[PDB]
Amino acid sequence: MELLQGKTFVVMGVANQRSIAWGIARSLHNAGAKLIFTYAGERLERNVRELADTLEGQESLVLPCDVTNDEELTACFETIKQEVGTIHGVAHCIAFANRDDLKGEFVDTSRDGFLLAQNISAFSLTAVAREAKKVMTEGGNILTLTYLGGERVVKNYNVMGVAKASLEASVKYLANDLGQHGIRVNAISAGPIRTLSAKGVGDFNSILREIEERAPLRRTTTQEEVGDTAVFLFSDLARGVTGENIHVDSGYHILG
Amino acid sequence: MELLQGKTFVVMGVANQRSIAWGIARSLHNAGAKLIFTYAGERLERNVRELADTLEGQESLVLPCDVTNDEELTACFETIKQEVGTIHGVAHCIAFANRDDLKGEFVDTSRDGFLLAQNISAFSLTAVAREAKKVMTEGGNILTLTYLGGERVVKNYNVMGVAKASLEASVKYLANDLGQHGIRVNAISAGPIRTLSAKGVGDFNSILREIEERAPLRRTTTQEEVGDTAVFLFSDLARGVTGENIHVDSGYHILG
Amino acid sequence: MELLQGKTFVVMGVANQRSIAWGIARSLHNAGAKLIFTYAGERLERNVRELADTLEGQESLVLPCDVTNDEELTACFETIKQEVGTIHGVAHCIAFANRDDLKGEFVDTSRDGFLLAQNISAFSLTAVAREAKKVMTEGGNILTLTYLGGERVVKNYNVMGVAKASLEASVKYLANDLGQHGIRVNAISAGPIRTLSAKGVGDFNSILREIEERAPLRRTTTQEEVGDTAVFLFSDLARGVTGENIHVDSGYHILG
Amino acid sequence: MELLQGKTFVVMGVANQRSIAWGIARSLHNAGAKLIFTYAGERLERNVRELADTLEGQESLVLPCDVTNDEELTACFETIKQEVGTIHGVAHCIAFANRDDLKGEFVDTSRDGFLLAQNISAFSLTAVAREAKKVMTEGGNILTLTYLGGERVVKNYNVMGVAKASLEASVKYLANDLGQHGIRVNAISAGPIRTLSAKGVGDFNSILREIEERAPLRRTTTQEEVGDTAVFLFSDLARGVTGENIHVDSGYHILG
Numbered sequence A, B, C, D: 001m002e003l004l005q006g007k008t009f010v011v012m013g014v015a016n017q018r019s020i021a022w023g024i025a026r027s028l029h030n031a032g033a034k035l036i037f038t039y040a041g042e043r044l045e046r047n048v049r050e051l052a053d054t055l056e057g058q059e060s061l062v063l064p065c066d067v068t069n070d071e072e073l074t075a076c077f078e079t080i081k082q083e084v085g086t087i088h089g090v091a092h093c094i095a096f097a098n099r100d101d102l103k104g105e106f107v108d109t110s111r112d113g114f115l116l117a118q119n120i121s122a123f124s125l126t127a128v129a130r131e132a133k134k135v136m137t138e139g140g141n142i143l144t145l146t147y148l149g150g151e152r153v154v155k156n157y158n159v160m161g162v163a164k165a166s167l168e169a170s171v172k173y174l175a176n177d178l179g180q181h182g183i184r185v186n187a188i189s190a191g192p193i194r195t196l197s198a199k200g201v202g203d204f205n206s207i208l209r210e211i212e213e214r215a216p217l218r219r220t221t222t223q224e225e226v227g228d229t230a231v232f233l234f235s236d237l238a239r240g241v242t243g244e245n246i247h248v249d250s251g252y253h254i255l256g
Ligand SMILES: NC(=O)c1ccc[n+]([C@@H]2O[C@H](COP(=O)([O-])OP(=O)(O)OC[C@H]3O[C@@H](n4cnc5c(N)ncnc54)[C@H](O)[C@@H]3O)[C@@H](O)[C@H]2O)c1
Pocket: A012, A013, A014, A015, A016, A018, A019, A020, A021, A039, A040, A041, A044, A065, A066, A067, A068, A092, A093, A094, A095, A096, A120, A145, A146, A147, A148, A189, A190, A191, A192, A193, A194, A195, A196, A197, A198
């Protein structure tokens, strides 16, 4: 409501209306924050601008940011500095892997396919954290989105699971680095949600019914449940929480 | 100020101003919640009553509830059902072990001691949950406090460590049971905090100092940081969070 | 092979020819070990003495030992000390919980059933390790059997899951106490196996069918696979392994 | 003495007498296995050939295999195929990261340093498995060596910790892919041992003294304890174990 009043956050990864990052943006805005959006490339610019503009308030800054490109990533955060000077956090909702690796056997993943997944889905957290460390002059929280596949084997998640494991270990090492700089680093492990990228995981419809049937809360997750947990982590209420991975998956993670 | 407005919660475990339960009480109260307190035996009625009255708004119910007593436990929740219509959660901050067993080697723990710690520090959660369920129509969240010692070996924690491990598994199984009924069950794993029961844990000062020197946030936690994470878990913001264990310990849990 | 020549181990838990403890006995025997068997009640002395005799040229010591009875427990190892003097390990394969509690919801577990399960399935490892220590003057290993349900929520496991969590934490703390005396403590988390006690777990056939179809090895575990892993753990090949939990479940534990 | 008789294993990562892979080689040899060795580059050809010759009996195949190079990888395994035909396993003991990244803040790791560690220390396992799979027509085990730094934050391990988390997740996805082909994939999480590349880790003597004082067994690990646990994983005694990470660290991993 006013939980994030006066704070400005950088949300990375909105692609369209179903993006979990969009769910995060709406929750942060409703909690009173100001936002900055970064999108992967020119193709997405229109979607993010129009989405950003549905939010009441000042025209939000929308900037291209291919996290695979160091010069653009660095220039993006320099622009952010010149524009607002200080931000209070970054929501990192980025991941990618060649579609053909998310099927069949993980053992057939090509080297380039594996490094690509690692580069975009795990390293980008660290590269982003490094630039955000510069503008988060008042400390704050850095968030990332992970998935159960990084902790245990999920069918067809393959190289993405290995990349998330690496992302989750990154959260821990970054939390270890940044805490003394007043910066908390956390992850949200969301349960399956229908998004543009969900199309790369096989038989999604049946995965969702499995969640509805077996998850403790008997229902699938929503972008809003994730965004609201994100509000907590970016807010002062989470002051003592860092290097933590919170599962917003209707409790599915406890099932053996 | 309004996050918990219109909600009523039971805070079990207040012994004095330093109790973690009290920090939770204050946080819930500052978030607009109505509180009902439960104390162990008569010796603690005066203390709790006093602290409760120090809050404002309508006076708070203060009921005796010794978790080793099934009758007094069922009576307490009977009173609550009659006095208040519904509650939206319970904050379980109860634990006990004989100081004798918290010294030296765990292999020397008596069957009596081991069963006593299990009964009070772990089973109580379930006992409380079965009663809470009766007055928790509309749903809500059940919270309990645990410690790292239930996940790994912490010097001197011994039998309490094994108790917390049960508590922690109990959280998972209860979450699995109660989710269909709209009830979430989560735990907060707090870092060392200076409390009455902190005397059983030998050489606390060295403990607080190692945390300040090695924890990512370079500070020990407080009853308020825990209180604030509880506000989150009892709120609708934590809608899809259940069967989780959130470490409010300055990030110490990630260290190896 | 001949890994255990001249070593003597106590196998507690044989009840059946299908008992996992018996699978361990046979493997220990084939690796050249001398065994001492203990059985719950007179009701089982017949089967154990009978099975124990089927081993080639052997002393075949078989003593009674109800782990809930401190007198018997103490007399059993006193007898062992008098007749053998020094043993090199103990296989703790004991567990129990009222069948009622293995049904329906965990929240309805009664206080006595919960403590019954903890006393028999978890504390006994400690009570046994305490006596065993007196007779393991050359170091050695203490093994116990746990199951996945102690780490994550497995349906129809309820109170056993929580007793197993205490058991697994007990392993860690005992390992921590005993390592300095040259004594290692480890667990084997076995996958579902048709034993007498497995009849207490609902719809076992489908449980086995699921392991067969989804476990990495596409087959269910056998008492022999567990036995052979016990051989490694009691042998010197595992002298650097303590406080560990080895899943002998065709890799099922890794599945998310 | 003949646990691995008739079996042939490929050991990757011998650099010198103090390498953990050399400890594994002696252990596998003592148990009767035949060995094929691979070295990183010309520089090590000598050292490895000399150590191999020491394993009297049969002139062991010693081949170059830079895991960074696709052709060498293919060349090495096609040679084993044409030369030996069938192997029963591979011991993967390879890791690398720039020294500068193993100090200071992990957040400062460069994209290249990060992808380099991932490539050599994590992907290499998969590339090796893809090739080994072609010559393990009879099944068998693939082993890798990880470290606590991949599960939890270990000071200065930084990027290697993230690489190891990635390696550990890979062990699981590979176990899940190769199990149906009769191939098990496992890891040994070795405790700190004085090796050639251990010089890259912070004050090693104080690290070792810490383990000697805190570790359950009150002693540091050796290449032999690792080698003996490797013997088990490659033997038929471990046929039911896959996707597992056995800690051969004197029990240190259990400490909180
Ligand atoms: N949808 C789910 O069920 C689910 C569950 C758990 C975790 N996640 C994670 O949440 C995040 C967001 O995923 P989503 O499900 O909303 O899908 P999405 O397709 O909406 O978002 C993925 C985002 O990554 C961006 N991206 C890819 N390469 C990029 C690059 N090189 N530079 C900058 N951005 C790049 C895409 O533009 C997109 O905005 C991902 O990390 C994903 O793994 C999703």
